[PDB]
């Protein structure tokens, strides 16, 4: 609907007079912000602007998943609400706000002006540790979505930040790390476009590796007569094995275990045996 002018800047630590360049989830300048009480998807953080009492963040909002209610009668409670409170944790006692969820912490930044530009000072870093994919308001107001972008802020009060991905002039300003540019011609780095989608292509394999059968064999070789097997044409899914086989040791050399679910190997050899503790 509308256009956000140069609004939606929040502090991403103390610093002063640094002209610091930071890549984070920011609201692009001159972006589309919707105007509105339905369920509003949260995505990667939101910039809310505006009688409004508070907010309700959550995933299902149906008592099957923890949701957090912020309200003013200031009360913040995270519990399994029906849309009454059981099995739950955190409890506490022109408008603009920015909501982000990083490392289980809900960052809430606030600001108010008598109506431009204004940096939103941090208010809360709540240790909630819940998955937020939807939210609602509790009672005309504008909602915008943050995207990953690189900004160049001035600074310990932020002043006149610039977005590097909107104009050639802004790109030049960001690549020179200065807000005042003299007459001339300068080369610039690519701040214009960054990838958004992903293109995963894996081979046409559907069989599952027989880890369960191998690890459940009734007999194993002596260490001096260790065998070898070639594993091929199967999908290495260790998750199916979490139901058993506690795996008192899972040291991985070269590759990282977390990556083993997104790697393809040309040849896998399994050598099995029995030893002392």
């Amino acid at each position: 609907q509308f256009l956000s002018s140069h609004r939606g800047v929040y502090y991403p630590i103390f610093r002063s007079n640094v002209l610091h360049l930071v890549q984070d989830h920011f609201l692009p300048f001159d972006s589309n912000v919707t105007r509105f009480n339905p369920i509003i998807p949260f995505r990667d953080g939101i910039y809310f602007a505006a009688v409004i009492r508070g907010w309700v963040f959550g995933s299902t909002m149906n008592n099957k998943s923890q949701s957090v209610i912020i309200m003013n009668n200031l009360v913040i409670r995270a519990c399994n609400f029906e849309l009454n409170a059981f099995n739950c944790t955190f409890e506490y006692v022109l408008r603009e706000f920015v909501f982000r969820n990083k490392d289980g912490f809900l960052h809430v930044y606030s600001g108010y002006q008598p109506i431009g530009f204004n940096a939103l000072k941090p208010i809360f870093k709540l240790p909630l540790g819940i998955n937020i994919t939807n939210f609602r308001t509790l009672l005309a107001y504008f909602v915008g979505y943050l995207k990953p972008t690189t900004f160049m802020l001035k600074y310990g009060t932020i002043t006149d930040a610039v977005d590097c991905s909107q104009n050639p002039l802004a790109e030049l300003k960001c690549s020179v790390k200065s807000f005042e540019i003299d007459k001339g011609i300068y080369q610039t780095s690519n701040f214009r476009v960054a990838p958004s989608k992903e293109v995963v292509r894996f081979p046409n394999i559907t069989n599952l590796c027989p880890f369960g059968e191998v690890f459940n064999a009734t007999t194993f070789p002596s260490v001096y007569a260790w065998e070898r097997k070639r594993i091929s044409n199967c999908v290495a899914d260790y998750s199916v094995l979490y139901n058993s086989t506690s795996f008192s040791t899972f040291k991985c050399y070269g590759v990282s275990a977390t990556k083993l679910n997104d790697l393809c190997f040309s040849n896998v050899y399994a050598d099995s045996f029995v030893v002392k503790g």
């Binding site: 923890q66 540790g129 979490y242 506690s246 275990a257 977390t258 083993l260």
Partner: protein, 97 residues
């Protein structure tokens, strides 16, 4: 055997389904046996862990929910074929290794 999983970068049932630590962890981890307190001869089943989840937890995230799980995204109604309970008890015994 699951204490090894409480560290940044590890993967396993605890690391990715129950408790996840940030890659930029700044702190400490303490662990001590309580076989004389948290275990019993008949078995102390009051301790549970989540062994199924569609996606891995983000760092420092909690997953309090007991909805019946189905690998195929079906409408499960009770524990049975293709309807698993995501929570499983540890079953701590005094004499176990």
């Amino acid at each position: 055997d699951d204490v090894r999983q409480i560290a940044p970068g590890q993967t396993g049932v605890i690391a990715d389904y129950n408790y996840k630590l940030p890659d930029d962890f700044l702190g400490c981890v303490l662990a001590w046996n309580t076989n004389s307190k948290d275990s019993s001869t008949s078995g102390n089943y009051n301790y549970l862990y989540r062994w199924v989840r569609r996606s891995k937890l983000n760092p420092y995230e909690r997953d309090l929910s007991n909805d019946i799980y189905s690998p195929g995204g079906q409408s499960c109604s009770a524990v049975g074929p293709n309807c698993y309970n995501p929570l499983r008890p540890y079953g701590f015994f005094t004499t176990a290794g």
